[PDB]
Amino acid sequence: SMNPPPPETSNPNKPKRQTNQLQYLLRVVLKTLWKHQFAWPFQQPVDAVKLNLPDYYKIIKTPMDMGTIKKRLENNYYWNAQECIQDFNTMFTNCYIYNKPGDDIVLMAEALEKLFLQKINELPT
Ligand code: NA
Ligand code: NA
Ligand code: NA
């Protein structure tokens, strides 16, 4: 019923680098979604306490959010684009698992995911 600690956004042992693809993921993908009108619920870890959702972290064991993603990218936490794309996918999957089809938050996620897939289509090959 507490929130869990947030996902780590830096690790002193994990190697860093910034690929052209990782730059694109921060400067195009993350930024386009971050600025979207529906972005706020996804801009930080789900606060199950403030939202009064005591079963959220009983159901969702791999939480992820764009604030974590953004910090990870800003910190060169990822080694490759696939790691970061996986975190976006996890973020969307979590929302669909926990919520019902037709919920406002699911419609918001579906909107962001459509934009995400469109921008990943232009990831530098
Ligand atoms: Na570039
Ligand atoms: Na996805
Ligand atoms: Na569900």
Author numbering: 42 to 166
What do the paper's sentences say?
Reduction of c-Myc levels has been demonstrated following treatment with degraders independently targeting both CBP/EP30026−31 and BRD4.32−42 Here, we pursued a strategy of targeting c-Myc through dual degradation of both CBP/EP300 and BRD4, via the small-molecule inhibitor ISOX-DUAL 1(43). The latter inhibits BRD4 and CBP/EP300 with micromolar potency and was deemed to be a suitable candidate to assess whether a dual degradation approach would offer a synergistic benefit in the reduction of c-Myc, compared to inhibition or degradation of the proteins individually. Several high-resolution crystal structures (1.1–1.9 Å) of BRD4-degrader complexes were determined.
We first tested a subset of VHL-recruiting degraders (compounds 42–45) and observed clear dose-dependent ubiquitination of BRD4, but not CBP, with all four degraders tested. A hook effect was evident for BRD4 ubiquitination, with structure–activity relationship (SAR) suggesting a greater degree of ubiquitination at lower compound concentration with increased linker length. The VHL-binding moiety was always disordered in these structures, but the linker was visible in most of the chains. The increased affinity compared with the parent scaffold may be due to such a hydrophobic interaction of the linker with a hydrophobic surface patch. The E3 ligase ligand is clearly solvent-exposed (as opposed to 35) and this may also explain its ability to ubiquitinate BRD4.
